[model samples]
Target: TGCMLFADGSGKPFSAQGDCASQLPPASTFKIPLALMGYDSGFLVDEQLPALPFKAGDPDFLPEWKQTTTPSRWMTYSVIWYSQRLTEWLGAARFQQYVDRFDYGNRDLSGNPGKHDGLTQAWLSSSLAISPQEQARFLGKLVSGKLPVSAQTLQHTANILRQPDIDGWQIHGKTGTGYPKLLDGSLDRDQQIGWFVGWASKQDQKLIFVHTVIQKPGKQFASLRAREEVFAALPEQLKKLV
Candidate 1:
């Protein structure tokens, strides 16, 4: 089961299907908004500054995350610790304020129940959740320059998300993966929820897209699969739009 949403710069829907309204954790996709907050709040000095070292006990699920990370590397590796550090520096009140201003997802950074780790884990399959529709809408706001941040902040964030141009369109995207909870409220490792959300531009035309999937666990990261799926289909998808 999955969902996909595509919209124009003005938030006009091109296609919307599946359970696009169901809310799920934003996972690494939240980094898109976090980048905005980080740059706006001055927590992220630039793509290369504020490069933080990986300390012991930081979330190190992936080997790439264990090294010193700049904002660029952080986005490429989806470094959870760097994101946590940024949010920590932003502090709770400011972090919450950004979320509220963005009107992102549920605006719930409460983290896991009773865990008091919202600052570090709310968007990591915990409290923060959003639908595919919402994700595309947010990207629409971003590409349309409707968000509250300065133009430089938006450009910097976009620079980090840049993907190689496909066909004639320039792409900026992020991938996210998380596990759905079982009946017992514990994560179900057998299944993965994947998301690929961002915007594409060709000349003056811009489109916002969100592609999400739920599938059996596999050796390849689910988020990567979701992104690849979008990449494989996007050219054709764009042709149809035109």
Candidate 2:
């Protein structure tokens, strides 16, 4: 199943379809809020500073993640280690506070039951979950500067999420991939959850959107497919609104 939601700058829903109410793991898309927390909490230190080096025990799922990463590269590459370190610096209490303040997802950062890894793995298909509707609403708050964060924090996070313009609308978004657990409590790799979420702005018009898909096992990453599909469809989608 899948879902898509769109909202204006005022956090008012404009269009919504599919299973938009199903709450699922946010996966890497949580980085957007994490970026805000990182910046506001003084751990991120701009897009270039606080360049963290790769460590031996870090999650090196991708080769790019095994190198030093800056804020921009971290977001572009979806570097898991960088996110882990940022959360680590934020500590459990502070990280939880940020999530609570953002009113993100189910607001459950408990991670796996009794695993005590919430600080590092909650958003990685463990405990944190959100619906497409929630994602769109969060982006609306972000784009409209309504979130409880400093202006610089919002700008820094937005700077990292910037994407190439699509049909004259500047895009800022993030992609996330996740897998559901089977009866045995292990990840079901064959089933993937994909997400492409963010906002688009052109002059006086600003729109926030969330697109999520659930796919069977495939050669291509689900998040990439979600992003590509959104990029191809956004222009036409915007025509309906503007």
Candidate 3:
């Protein structure tokens, strides 16, 4: 079993199967905050900033990313290099400060102080991390305009995080593979770990949810199940909240 959390923010929440407080790598899910921080910091000045230029050989770069890209495409596609660019823009100092400010996980960006470390790979691996419960908490901060980021920045972050309406409810979220870290502090494509996080709402009824599936021994495809089983099944699963 994995984990799930949901609530209307009026009382005690509901959870199942796994510990919501168990900390795990936030992975690409950190983009949720990265986007906000970028906007507030002026690094991500505009969503339409003519697309940051990236190269063909950038580490883990996708083919689609060879072309110029914008924040909208970055979120929808989970473009790796663009995220790297965002992290690089934030740099280590600002990144850690924000992480501490947000109280995200252990707030460890990495022990190394140079490019050889988490400068561009913290949340992607284990250097920086968060938990499913914390994921929901962060989302609440975002939706309620409590993240210390400006409203305009939050709106920009929300715009990029937007998923198509599902069963008449607005869906805003992110998907991430908590890929295992390598010996030299890199990501291993195999033995995937994953998380599905965000909130769903229909007018007055709104709920925040986080689903985390960790990698297990001998379970190569286990990570995919988080999204395959949870995200794809949202239409029916959301009925409970409706």
Give TM per candidate. 0.95, 0.95, 0.82
Tens-place lDDT per residue, model 2, 138-208, is 88887788898889998899889999997788899999999866647645545799999998888899888
Pairs in steric clash, model 2 = none
Query: Model 3: per-residue lDDT, tens digit, 1-242?
Result: 36766644432256545767666778778888888888989878666763887775776545676677798877766777887787787787888888888777778888344566676777766567676777777777777766788889977887888876776888777888765555555455454667777777788776777787766546244445665656676666568765
- Please give, for residues 60-155, the per-residue lDDT of candidate 1 as tens digits: 889999899999998898999999899888899999999998989889888887779899898988778898888877888888888899999998
Alpha carbon lDDT of each predicted model: 0.87, 0.86, 0.72
Model 3, residue 213: what's the lDDT?
A: 74
Alpha-carbon runs more than 4 Å astray in model 2: 183-189
lDDT against true structure, model 3: 0.72
Worst 10 residues of 2 by lDDT: 181-190
